[PDB]
Amino acid sequence: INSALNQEDPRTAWEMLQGIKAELDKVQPDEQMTPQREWLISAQEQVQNQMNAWTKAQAKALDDSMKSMNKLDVIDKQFQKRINGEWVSTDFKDMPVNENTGEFKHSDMVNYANKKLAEIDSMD
Amino acid sequence: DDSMKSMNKLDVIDKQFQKRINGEWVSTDFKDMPVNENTGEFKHSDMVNYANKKLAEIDSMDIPDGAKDAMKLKYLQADSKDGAFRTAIGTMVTDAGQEWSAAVINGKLPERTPAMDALRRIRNADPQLIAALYPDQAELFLTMDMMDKQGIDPQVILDADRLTVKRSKEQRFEDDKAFESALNASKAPEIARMPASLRESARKIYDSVKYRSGNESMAMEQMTKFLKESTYTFTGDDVDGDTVGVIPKNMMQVNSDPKSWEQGRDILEEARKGIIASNPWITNKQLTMYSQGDSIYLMDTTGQVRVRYDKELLSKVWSENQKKLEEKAREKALADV
Amino acid sequence: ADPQLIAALYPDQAELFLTMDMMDKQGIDPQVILDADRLTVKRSKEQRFEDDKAFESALNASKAPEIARMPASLRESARKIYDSVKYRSGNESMAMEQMTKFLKESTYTFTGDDVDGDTVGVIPKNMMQVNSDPKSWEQGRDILEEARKGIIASNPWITNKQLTMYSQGDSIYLMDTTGQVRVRYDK
Amino acid sequence: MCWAAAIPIAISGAQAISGQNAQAKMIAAQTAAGRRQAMEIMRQTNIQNADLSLQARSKLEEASAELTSQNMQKVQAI
Amino acid sequence: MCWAAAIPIAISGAQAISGQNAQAKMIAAQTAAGRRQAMEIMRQTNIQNADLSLQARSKLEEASAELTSQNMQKVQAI
Amino acid sequence: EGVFRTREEMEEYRHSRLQEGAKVYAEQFGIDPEDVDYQRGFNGDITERNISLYGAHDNFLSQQAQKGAIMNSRVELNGVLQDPDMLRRPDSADFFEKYIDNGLVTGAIPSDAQATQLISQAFSDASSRAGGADFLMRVGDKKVTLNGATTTYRELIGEEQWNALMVTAQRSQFETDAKLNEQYRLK
Amino acid sequence: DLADERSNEIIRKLTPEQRREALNNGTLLYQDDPYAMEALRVKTGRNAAYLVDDDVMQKIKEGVFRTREEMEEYRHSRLQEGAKVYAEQFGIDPEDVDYQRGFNGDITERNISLYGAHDNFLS
Amino acid sequence: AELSNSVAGMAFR
């Protein structure tokens, strides 16, 4: 049961736990309050809570993906400006939130350099 | 009687320990909850037995290696240096150390290397942490990371570590003076401002690598690449751009994984910036960030403005902030559906 | 069966115990020790005198609860385990990791309840044994810990780190620095 | 092990038309493993993982996947 | 020793239907040892130990143990 | 256990190696065969042994057919869903429900356990393809039977069992769409 | 074999509604359910047909073949082989008539896809 | 500010 709980993604957690229940059903065929069944169904509430957390985390990942893409293209455009023109101050403080890009973590410029360098590597 | 007492007090210990892992401030030292009536006394024997049985239990779980090692680490923090888990992982480390020693004496390396393999599994996941807690066998970590990450054979280290002369107490004085000249005359930010914990380790790696093939560049080479793998250099916004600090990549960690160290750097920079603009005249050149044993501290040169930043508060503030920002994320993400 | 009682009563041949435990417990061949112990130079005085300063500084300047402090009894052997490994494979760090492992098997470093957590003493794992099986050392660790919260909870006029405990030639004496609390626990 | 050498026997003067050979054999290999080296009590864990691959192991490289799907629908119920 | 090589003769191209061979032979080996290399005065000691294994050495891997027991009962007296 | 084809080889091989092993094992002890008393002992108790053996063969062949059926239905549903955007089509919603149902009535996917396992695996697999919101959002809600009660899809899948899939599929769609955008912009 | 028609006919009788629970515990066993074995053989056959025939032809069609007359020969022979091998690989079903309906498709769709791929290659 | 997320917030608190 603890293994069923400690899975990486709570999906596999829930389906493995459900299979373990469907199997316990054989050997313990009376649905009731078998001590093992008590253990098993705190496990169900547990995996429900873990699925709650997983939903929240995937949603945050969605938000980060959009924020990163938008601020990334903003960084790249304001950087092409520096490459072609001059005196653009690409240090940290950039073209700020239009309405929806993000506070510009320091993470983007490192991510920007890395992704853009690989991008150049992948060009034709 | 002992079997029942041990099982009961063992589950009590484990629950009150999961409390410490998830929550905080639980005092798992020795004095726990013995009011179970059945559990009765806690001997000191349980916590050692608890750590050992639980570590093997984790080993026997069904999950893939990643979850196993993340779990070994999320248990390695935190007990109050008792150490129960710290000493378990520690004796694992010294086992790997003595085993590689025996390989050195033996002349080749014995096959299947159980302790070395288990250590490779655990330490691959957080290089800095395992090293930090045991500030004694950095030599083994260096050699293992040479052995696996880099491509060198685990045969060409064997001779050079078996062929070494005994330093014989004479050329060392020259060697201590040596650590001192390439250090001072380095002028590379990280090595010069060497952050402190890392300085205490630093001394080791240099002396180790030198005894191998032609050295004193290869030695500086490895030492610098290590200090790069283990401390961010916080650069200033000015275009010089002179460094303002070297704060260790292990202690900026929000939460428990190193992706988190990265996320935290994004807190410390926001902090260092607000100060510079807020108190006008504190030009970047003036500000220093200085660590200590365990604290990230931040000062403008005049002693007036100086904000502490600490593992506990940085961690837990980021935890709640990420929490309810991720809440907002879920809210409008599910608003689409 | 008991690599401790046998170790103690005969401190003279700790060299043989080290070599045998190298031979069987660890995986090294009983051929690669043979040459290195046959190939040795005579320390002639000069070599010996220098290695011996060398151990002396190094052990003293290493900062690990175990290597520091010293069990008391062990030093003489500990030193012996050191030289042997240094002559065999000549890496001093390798020797040490074969001295530390040994002091570490042999003694238990009692630690303090405080979160520092600074050590109070290293008592040798042999002399706090209770009955014959080594699990008796394990059991004794419990009596002594209950006592040390016995000492700290009985009239702690002041405790801090002032209280230390150690072993005389044969007595896990616990004593605070002062004459206030000396407790003798004997095998 | 003898069988693999037997497949290796095919390539001698260095033969090009043989990606088919590795392919078919790893594939069959998967059918055999998958089919026969496992237990079907509902509890599964990592066994299901290695299995899943045996599940993608027959199937198709997907030319047929495009063609199959178009089909299973007209056949099962649509 | 000649006989073991004779059993070894069976595995050549490295084929795998042979766990049966080690099995049956260690088992028989046990029947022979056990049966014949011992003395039956009531005093026994460590001899009984090595023996006991010869006692678990025939018996069954237990599929038959489940089946036997079901049986010895209906046969002996029940 | 692992290595055997249909019924014939079983009793063939058993009969042959049976009578031989009989005499070779009676040869170990006193040379009794061929006496009539060894017949009564060796020949059982035979109905019990035969029924146990043939029941084990039933178990093996049933496990074999079950392995085959699960592999087959897994391959079919993988081809129909895991394929990149068979889902986006207007027909795929009714189809999944119908397949699961028919397979239940046939009844393939034996049995219920394997059914919930397979349907909850496929759902996740579908969520991680670009095709996803549409498939999940349409099969919710559909009527599908089970052991306890007939019940909608959303229903089987708790409020944090379904909302999770729902969001993670939306996120995967966003990911793959941005991936297509970036491939185009790379060109 | 022919004798198992006993329980085959007897089970045709068992109601489909309550057949499944019986199947889950231990009353029946998969080997004797005619309806289950039907779908199974047929599915096994589609799988076989699709996988073998198609992978084999497509990959070859894509980069190493010739005229319609050639590919044509190559496939039918491959078709037969695959059935035998895969058949053995699952319970030994062939040569039963139910494996024909499963293996033989759904054949017009496969042929038209293959010949369309050949059109694409020659074009 | 006080009750804000946004990076600033973390540093301030």
Coordinates of N, CA, C and O in Angstrom, one line a residue, chain B residues 87-206:
Chain B
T87 N 23.6 8.9 10.4 CA 24.7 7.9 10.7 C 24.5 6.6 9.8 O 25.5 6.0 9.5
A88 N 23.2 6.3 9.5 CA 23.1 5.2 8.6 C 23.7 5.5 7.2 O 24.5 4.7 6.7
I89 N 23.3 6.6 6.6 CA 23.9 7.0 5.3 C 25.4 7.2 5.5 O 26.2 6.9 4.6
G90 N 25.8 7.6 6.7 CA 27.2 7.8 6.9 C 28.0 6.5 6.9 O 29.1 6.5 6.3
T91 N 27.5 5.5 7.6 CA 28.2 4.2 7.6 C 28.2 3.6 6.2 O 29.1 2.9 5.8
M92 N 27.1 3.9 5.4 CA 27.2 3.6 4.0 C 28.3 4.2 3.3 O 29.0 3.6 2.5
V93 N 28.5 5.5 3.5 CA 29.6 6.3 2.9 C 30.9 5.7 3.3 O 31.8 5.5 2.4
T94 N 31.2 5.5 4.6 CA 32.5 4.9 5.0 C 32.7 3.5 4.4 O 33.8 3.1 4.2
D95 N 31.6 2.8 4.2 CA 31.7 1.5 3.6 C 32.2 1.6 2.2 O 33.2 1.0 1.8
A96 N 31.6 2.5 1.4 CA 32.1 2.8 0.1 C 33.6 3.3 0.1 O 34.4 2.9 -0.8
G97 N 33.9 4.1 1.1 CA 35.3 4.6 1.2 C 36.3 3.5 1.5 O 37.3 3.4 0.8
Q98 N 36.0 2.6 2.5 CA 36.9 1.5 2.8 C 37.0 0.6 1.6 O 38.0 0.0 1.3
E99 N 35.9 0.4 0.9 CA 35.8 -0.5 -0.2 C 36.7 0.0 -1.4 O 37.5 -0.8 -2.0
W100 N 36.6 1.3 -1.7 CA 37.5 1.8 -2.7 C 39.0 1.8 -2.2 O 39.9 1.6 -3.0
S101 N 39.2 1.9 -0.9 CA 40.5 1.8 -0.4 C 41.0 0.4 -0.7 O 42.2 0.2 -1.2
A102 N 40.2 -0.7 -0.3 CA 40.7 -2.0 -0.5 C 40.9 -2.3 -2.0 O 41.8 -3.0 -2.4
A103 N 40.1 -1.7 -2.9 CA 40.4 -1.7 -4.3 C 41.8 -1.1 -4.6 O 42.6 -1.7 -5.4
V104 N 42.1 0.0 -3.9 CA 43.4 0.6 -4.2 C 44.6 -0.4 -3.7 O 45.5 -0.6 -4.5
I105 N 44.5 -0.9 -2.5 CA 45.5 -1.8 -2.1 C 45.6 -3.0 -3.0 O 46.7 -3.4 -3.5
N106 N 44.4 -3.6 -3.4 CA 44.4 -4.8 -4.1 C 45.0 -4.7 -5.5 O 45.4 -5.6 -6.1
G107 N 45.0 -3.4 -6.0 CA 45.6 -3.2 -7.3 C 44.7 -3.0 -8.5 O 45.0 -2.3 -9.4
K108 N 43.6 -3.7 -8.4 CA 42.5 -3.6 -9.4 C 41.2 -3.3 -8.7 O 41.2 -3.0 -7.5
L109 N 40.1 -3.2 -9.4 CA 38.9 -3.0 -8.6 C 37.9 -4.2 -8.7 O 37.6 -4.6 -9.7
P110 N 37.6 -4.7 -7.5 CA 36.7 -5.9 -7.5 C 35.4 -5.6 -8.1 O 34.8 -4.5 -8.1
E111 N 34.8 -6.7 -8.7 CA 33.6 -6.5 -9.5 C 32.4 -6.3 -8.5 O 32.4 -6.7 -7.4
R112 N 31.4 -5.7 -9.1 CA 30.0 -5.7 -8.5 C 29.9 -4.8 -7.3 O 28.7 -4.4 -6.9
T113 N 31.0 -4.4 -6.7 CA 31.1 -3.1 -5.8 C 29.8 -2.7 -5.2 O 29.3 -1.6 -5.5
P114 N 29.3 -3.5 -4.2 CA 27.9 -3.2 -3.7 C 27.9 -1.8 -3.0 O 27.0 -1.0 -3.4
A115 N 28.8 -1.5 -2.1 CA 28.7 -0.3 -1.4 C 28.9 0.9 -2.3 O 28.2 1.9 -2.3
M116 N 29.9 0.8 -3.2 CA 30.1 1.9 -4.2 C 28.9 2.1 -5.1 O 28.5 3.2 -5.4
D117 N 28.2 1.0 -5.5 CA 27.0 1.1 -6.3 C 25.9 1.8 -5.6 O 25.2 2.7 -6.1
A118 N 25.7 1.4 -4.3 CA 24.6 2.1 -3.5 C 24.9 3.5 -3.3 O 24.0 4.4 -3.4
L119 N 26.2 3.8 -3.1 CA 26.6 5.2 -2.9 C 26.4 6.0 -4.2 O 25.9 7.2 -4.2
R120 N 26.7 5.4 -5.3 CA 26.5 6.1 -6.6 C 25.0 6.4 -6.8 O 24.6 7.5 -7.2
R121 N 24.2 5.4 -6.5 CA 22.7 5.6 -6.6 C 22.3 6.8 -5.8 O 21.6 7.7 -6.3
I122 N 22.7 6.8 -4.5 CA 22.1 7.9 -3.6 C 22.7 9.2 -4.0 O 22.0 10.2 -4.1
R123 N 24.0 9.3 -4.1 CA 24.7 10.6 -4.3 C 24.5 11.1 -5.7 O 24.3 12.4 -5.9
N124 N 24.3 10.3 -6.7 CA 24.0 10.9 -8.1 C 22.9 12.0 -7.9 O 23.0 13.0 -8.5
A125 N 21.9 11.8 -7.1 CA 20.8 12.7 -6.9 C 21.0 14.1 -6.3 O 20.4 15.1 -6.8
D126 N 21.9 14.2 -5.2 CA 22.2 15.6 -4.8 C 23.6 15.7 -4.4 O 23.9 15.8 -3.2
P127 N 24.5 15.8 -5.4 CA 25.9 15.9 -5.1 C 26.3 16.7 -3.9 O 27.0 16.3 -3.1
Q128 N 25.7 17.9 -3.8 CA 26.2 18.8 -2.8 C 25.8 18.4 -1.4 O 26.6 18.4 -0.5
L129 N 24.6 17.9 -1.2 CA 24.1 17.5 0.1 C 24.8 16.4 0.8 O 25.2 16.5 2.0
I130 N 25.1 15.3 0.1 CA 25.7 14.2 0.7 C 27.0 14.6 1.1 O 27.5 14.3 2.2
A131 N 27.7 15.4 0.3 CA 29.0 15.9 0.6 C 29.0 16.8 1.7 O 29.9 16.8 2.5
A132 N 28.0 17.6 1.8 CA 28.0 18.6 2.9 C 27.9 18.0 4.3 O 28.6 18.4 5.2
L133 N 27.0 17.0 4.4 CA 26.8 16.4 5.7 C 28.1 15.6 6.2 O 28.4 15.7 7.3
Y134 N 28.7 14.9 5.3 CA 30.0 14.3 5.7 C 31.1 15.1 5.1 O 31.5 14.8 4.0
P135 N 31.7 15.9 5.9 CA 32.8 16.8 5.4 C 34.1 16.2 5.6 O 35.1 16.8 5.9
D136 N 34.1 14.9 5.4 CA 35.3 14.1 5.7 C 35.8 13.3 4.4 O 36.9 13.4 4.0
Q137 N 34.9 12.6 3.8 CA 35.2 11.8 2.6 C 34.8 12.6 1.3 O 34.1 12.1 0.5
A138 N 35.3 13.8 1.2 CA 35.1 14.5 -0.1 C 36.0 13.8 -1.2 O 35.8 13.9 -2.4
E139 N 37.1 13.2 -0.7 CA 38.0 12.4 -1.6 C 37.3 11.4 -2.3 O 37.4 11.2 -3.6
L140 N 36.4 10.6 -1.6 CA 35.7 9.5 -2.3 C 34.7 10.1 -3.3 O 34.5 9.5 -4.3
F141 N 34.0 11.2 -2.9 CA 33.1 11.8 -3.8 C 33.8 12.3 -5.1 O 33.3 12.0 -6.2
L142 N 34.9 12.9 -5.0 CA 35.7 13.3 -6.1 C 36.1 12.1 -7.0 O 35.9 12.2 -8.2
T143 N 36.6 11.1 -6.4 CA 37.0 9.9 -7.2 C 35.8 9.2 -7.8 O 35.9 8.9 -9.0
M144 N 34.7 9.1 -7.2 CA 33.5 8.5 -7.8 C 33.0 9.3 -8.9 O 32.7 8.8 -10.0
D145 N 32.9 10.6 -8.7 CA 32.5 11.5 -9.8 C 33.4 11.6 -11.0 O 33.0 11.8 -12.1
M146 N 34.7 11.3 -10.7 CA 35.7 11.1 -11.8 C 35.3 9.8 -12.5 O 35.5 9.7 -13.7
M147 N 34.9 8.8 -11.7 CA 34.8 7.5 -12.2 C 33.6 7.3 -13.1 O 33.6 6.6 -14.1
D148 N 32.5 8.0 -12.8 CA 31.2 7.8 -13.5 C 30.9 8.9 -14.5 O 30.6 8.7 -15.7
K149 N 30.8 10.2 -14.0 CA 30.4 11.3 -14.8 C 31.4 11.5 -15.9 O 31.0 11.5 -17.1
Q150 N 32.6 11.8 -15.5 CA 33.7 11.9 -16.5 C 34.0 10.5 -17.0 O 33.7 9.5 -16.4
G151 N 34.8 10.4 -18.2 CA 34.9 9.2 -18.9 C 36.1 8.3 -18.5 O 36.4 7.3 -19.1
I152 N 36.9 8.8 -17.5 CA 38.2 8.1 -17.2 C 37.9 6.7 -16.7 O 36.8 6.4 -16.1
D153 N 38.8 5.8 -16.9 CA 38.7 4.4 -16.5 C 38.9 4.3 -14.9 O 39.7 5.0 -14.4
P154 N 38.1 3.5 -14.3 CA 38.5 3.1 -12.9 C 39.6 2.0 -12.8 O 39.5 1.0 -12.2
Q155 N 40.6 2.3 -13.6 CA 41.9 1.6 -13.5 C 43.1 2.6 -13.5 O 44.1 2.3 -12.9
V156 N 42.9 3.7 -14.2 CA 44.0 4.7 -14.3 C 44.1 5.6 -13.0 O 45.1 6.2 -12.8
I157 N 43.0 5.6 -12.2 CA 43.1 6.2 -10.9 C 43.7 5.2 -9.9 O 44.4 5.6 -9.0
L158 N 43.5 3.9 -10.1 CA 44.0 2.9 -9.2 C 45.5 2.9 -9.0 O 46.0 3.0 -7.9
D159 N 46.2 2.9 -10.1 CA 47.7 2.9 -10.0 C 48.1 4.2 -9.3 O 48.8 4.2 -8.3
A160 N 47.7 5.4 -9.9 CA 48.2 6.7 -9.4 C 47.9 6.9 -7.9 O 48.6 7.6 -7.3
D161 N 46.8 6.2 -7.4 CA 46.6 6.3 -6.0 C 47.3 5.2 -5.2 O 47.4 5.3 -4.0
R162 N 47.8 4.2 -5.9 CA 48.5 3.2 -5.3 C 50.0 3.4 -5.4 O 50.8 3.0 -4.6
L163 N 50.4 4.2 -6.5 CA 51.8 4.4 -6.8 C 52.4 5.6 -6.0 O 53.6 5.9 -5.9
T164 N 51.5 6.4 -5.3 CA 51.9 7.6 -4.7 C 53.0 7.4 -3.7 O 53.1 6.4 -3.0
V165 N 53.9 8.4 -3.6 CA 54.9 8.4 -2.5 C 54.3 8.9 -1.3 O 53.3 9.6 -1.3
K166 N 54.8 8.5 -0.1 CA 54.4 9.1 1.1 C 55.0 10.5 1.2 O 56.2 10.7 1.0
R167 N 54.1 11.5 1.4 CA 54.5 12.9 1.4 C 55.6 13.2 2.4 O 56.2 14.3 2.4
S168 N 55.8 12.3 3.4 CA 56.9 12.2 4.3 C 57.2 13.5 5.1 O 58.3 13.7 5.5
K169 N 56.2 14.3 5.3 CA 56.2 15.4 6.3 C 57.2 16.5 5.9 O 57.2 17.6 6.5
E170 N 57.9 16.3 4.8 CA 58.8 17.4 4.3 C 58.2 18.2 3.2 O 58.1 19.5 3.4
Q171 N 57.9 17.7 2.1 CA 57.4 18.5 1.0 C 56.1 19.0 1.2 O 55.6 20.0 0.5
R172 N 55.3 18.5 2.2 CA 54.1 19.1 2.6 C 54.2 20.6 3.0 O 53.3 21.4 2.7
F173 N 55.2 21.0 3.8 CA 55.2 22.4 4.3 C 55.1 23.2 3.0 O 54.3 24.1 2.9
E174 N 55.9 22.7 2.0 CA 55.9 23.4 0.8 C 54.5 23.2 0.2 O 54.0 24.2 -0.2
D175 N 53.8 22.1 0.4 CA 52.4 21.9 0.0 C 51.4 22.8 0.7 O 50.4 23.2 0.0
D176 N 51.5 23.1 2.0 CA 50.6 24.0 2.6 C 50.8 25.4 2.0 O 49.9 26.2 1.8
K177 N 52.1 25.7 1.9 CA 52.3 27.1 1.4 C 51.8 27.1 0.0 O 51.5 28.2 -0.5
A178 N 51.8 26.0 -0.7 CA 51.2 25.9 -2.0 C 49.8 26.1 -2.1 O 49.3 26.8 -3.0
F179 N 49.0 25.5 -1.2 CA 47.6 25.8 -1.2 C 47.5 27.3 -1.1 O 46.8 27.9 -1.7
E180 N 48.3 27.8 -0.2 CA 48.2 29.3 -0.1 C 48.6 30.2 -1.2 O 48.1 31.4 -1.2
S181 N 49.4 29.8 -2.2 CA 49.8 30.8 -3.2 C 48.8 30.8 -4.4 O 48.4 31.8 -4.9
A182 N 48.5 29.6 -4.9 CA 47.6 29.5 -6.0 C 46.2 30.0 -5.6 O 45.4 30.4 -6.5
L183 N 45.9 29.9 -4.3 CA 44.7 30.5 -3.8 C 44.7 32.0 -3.9 O 43.9 32.7 -4.6
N184 N 45.7 32.7 -3.2 CA 45.7 34.1 -3.2 C 46.0 34.7 -4.6 O 45.4 35.7 -5.0
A185 N 46.8 34.0 -5.4 CA 47.2 34.6 -6.7 C 46.3 34.1 -7.8 O 46.8 34.1 -9.0
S186 N 45.1 33.8 -7.4 CA 44.2 33.3 -8.4 C 43.4 34.3 -9.1 O 43.2 34.3 -10.4
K187 N 42.8 35.2 -8.4 CA 42.0 36.2 -9.0 C 40.9 35.7 -9.9 O 40.7 36.3 -11.0
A188 N 40.2 34.7 -9.5 CA 39.1 34.2 -10.3 C 38.0 34.4 -9.3 O 38.2 34.1 -8.1
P189 N 36.9 35.0 -9.6 CA 36.1 35.4 -8.4 C 35.9 34.3 -7.4 O 36.3 34.4 -6.3
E190 N 35.4 33.1 -7.9 CA 34.9 32.1 -6.9 C 36.0 31.6 -6.0 O 35.8 31.6 -4.8
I191 N 37.2 31.3 -6.5 CA 38.3 30.9 -5.7 C 38.7 31.9 -4.6 O 39.0 31.6 -3.5
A192 N 38.8 33.2 -5.0 CA 39.3 34.2 -4.1 C 38.4 34.5 -3.0 O 38.8 34.7 -1.9
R193 N 37.1 34.6 -3.2 CA 36.1 34.9 -2.2 C 35.7 33.6 -1.6 O 34.7 33.6 -0.8
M194 N 36.3 32.5 -2.0 CA 35.8 31.2 -1.5 C 34.8 31.1 -0.4 O 35.1 31.4 0.7
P195 N 33.6 30.7 -0.8 CA 32.8 30.7 0.4 C 33.1 29.7 1.4 O 33.7 28.6 1.1
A196 N 32.8 29.9 2.7 CA 33.6 29.2 3.8 C 33.5 27.7 3.9 O 34.5 27.0 4.2
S197 N 32.3 27.1 3.8 CA 32.2 25.7 3.9 C 32.9 25.0 2.8 O 33.5 24.0 2.9
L198 N 32.7 25.7 1.7 CA 33.3 25.1 0.5 C 34.8 25.2 0.6 O 35.5 24.4 0.0
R199 N 35.4 26.2 1.2 CA 36.8 26.3 1.5 C 37.3 25.2 2.4 O 38.3 24.6 2.1
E200 N 36.5 24.9 3.4 CA 36.9 23.7 4.1 C 36.9 22.5 3.3 O 37.8 21.7 3.4
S201 N 35.9 22.3 2.4 CA 36.1 21.1 1.5 C 37.3 21.3 0.5 O 38.1 20.5 0.4
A202 N 37.3 22.5 -0.2 CA 38.2 22.9 -1.2 C 39.6 22.4 -0.9 O 40.3 22.0 -1.8
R203 N 40.0 22.5 0.4 CA 41.4 22.1 0.6 C 41.5 20.7 0.2 O 42.5 20.4 -0.4
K204 N 40.5 19.9 0.5 CA 40.8 18.5 0.1 C 41.1 18.2 -1.4 O 42.2 17.9 -1.7
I205 N 40.1 18.5 -2.3 CA 40.1 18.1 -3.7 C 41.4 18.5 -4.3 O 42.0 17.7 -5.1
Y206 N 41.9 19.7 -4.0 CA 43.2 20.1 -4.6 C 44.3 19.2 -4.2 O 45.0 18.7 -5.1

